[PDB]
């Protein structure tokens, strides 16, 4: 299940729309440092 949700976040991290990609990148970086 967690594998599936991380794969989703990869698409939102590489979003065409800038605001969504930015916020997704923050949330993805807030995982790394934990």
């Amino acid at each position: 299940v967690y594998t599936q949700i991380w794969r989703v976040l990869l698409h939102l991290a590489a979003d065409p729309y800038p605001e969504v990609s930015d916020v997704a990148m923050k949330v993805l970086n807030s995982i790394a440092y934990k």
Binding site: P16, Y17, V23, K26
Partner: protein, 363 residues
């Protein structure tokens, strides 16, 4: 815990109740300036349609006039003409140059935002009749729409953007239906509805090679799709997805440069592969009606629905603009990788390997 972000979505929704309700909206107001300016644009449209129709009735003369010659910084990949306002957007791999053909000036310069590997394959003009937009589908899948692209007091504005699919990418806008059909290397023809912002239909292509081109017919479901192996499938979206395919005729073996359909009720699929041989198909027939062979090594081609001019290109600087019957009109001597007619006026853009854009006119 500070990493917890909260969207303003629920708060933005609440603004709905701050605005007035009981009173008549601004659009319904018949005496509003927006409606008069919208009716004024539509008044200009009906004149431009009539004036262009009068040019068609006078026939098409030989086209050699050069209106202007400018130079771009990047390679012109795809060009489109706004139907009524003279705005000729000439995009590049990492930018979108907006030129003009009356003043003769660069109007704007975007950055698509896509990486270096990607490439802007297709382009459209959404809501061309009024308040036009600029769809910019990237080859990897990213589609995006730009507003205020050639305005004085306004800047670039990306309305929305979403990774489609997932040749490059192909699109066919359908103003009246409201749909949008992305396609490319995948074996699927999606149909993104823009009113519901959801993919309605995913038509299976049934073909190994990439969907190089894709054109449809207004008021009917006639999705034509050229392919890299050579075949040109046709799918009807009214029937079941398995049954969507109607005809599958194959009389080529090369990438289809431009499988273009005509806007007449007598639809004619003018497909030109890398081989350079034209084969005019029909939707109700299994084989071609006419056959022509023009150039051995074709690089880029353009056609016009209203006037049947097959604007060819050439490695040796030639620009053969013949009719569908095969008559000679012009052979303009200059990799001419982009030609583009107007939807109404007989203007033809041209673009060589060098980043130089021309716009011809029939006097």
């Amino acid at each position: 815990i500070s990493a917890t972000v909260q969207t303003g979505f629920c708060d933005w929704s609440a603004r709905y109740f701050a605005q007035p309700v009981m009173k008549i909206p601004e659009e319904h107001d018949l005496e509003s300036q927006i409606r008069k300016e919208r009716e004024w644009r539509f008044l200009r449209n009906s004149r431009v349609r009539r004036q262009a129709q009068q040019v068609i009735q006078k026939g098409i003369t030989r086209l050699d006039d050069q209106i202007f010659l400018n130079r771009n910084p990047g390679v012109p990949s795809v060009v489109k003409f706004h139907p009524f306002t003279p705005c000729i957007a000439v995009a590049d791999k990492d930018s979108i140059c907006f030129w003009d053909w009356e003043k003769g000036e660069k109007l704007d310069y975007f950055h698509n935002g896509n990486p270096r590997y990607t490439r802007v394959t297709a382009m459209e003009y959404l809501n061309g009749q009024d308040c036009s937009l600029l769809l910019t589908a990237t080859d990897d899948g990213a589609i995006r729409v730009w507003k205020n692209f050639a305005d004085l007091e306004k800047n670039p504005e990306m309305v929305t953007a979403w990774q489609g699919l997932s040749a490059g990418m192909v699109v066919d806008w359908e103003q009246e239906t409201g749909l949008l059909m992305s396609s490319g290397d995948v074996r699927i023809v999606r149909i993104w509805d823009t009113d519901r912002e959801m993919k309605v239909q995913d038509i299976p292509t049934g073909a190994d090679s990439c969907v190089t081109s894709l054109s449809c017919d207004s008021h009917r479901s006639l999705i034509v799709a050229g392919l890299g192996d050579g075949s040109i499938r046709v799918y009807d979206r009214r029937m079941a997805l398995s049954e969507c395919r109607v005809m599958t005729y194959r009389e080529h073996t090369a990438w289809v440069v431009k499988a273009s359909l005509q806007k007449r009720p007598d639809g004619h699929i003018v497909s030109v592969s890398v081989n350079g041989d034209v084969r005019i198909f029909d939707p109700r027939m299994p084989e071609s009606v006419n056959v022509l062979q023009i150039v051995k090594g074709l690089t880029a081609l353009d056609i016009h629905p209203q006037a049947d001019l097959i604007a060819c290109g050439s490695v040796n600087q030639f620009t053969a603009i013949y009719n569908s019957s095969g008559e000679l009109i012009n052979n303009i001597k200059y990799a001419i990788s982009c030609l583009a007619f107007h939807p109404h006026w007989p203007h033809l853009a041209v673009g060589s390997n060098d980043y130089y854009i021309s716009v011809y006119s029939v006097e």
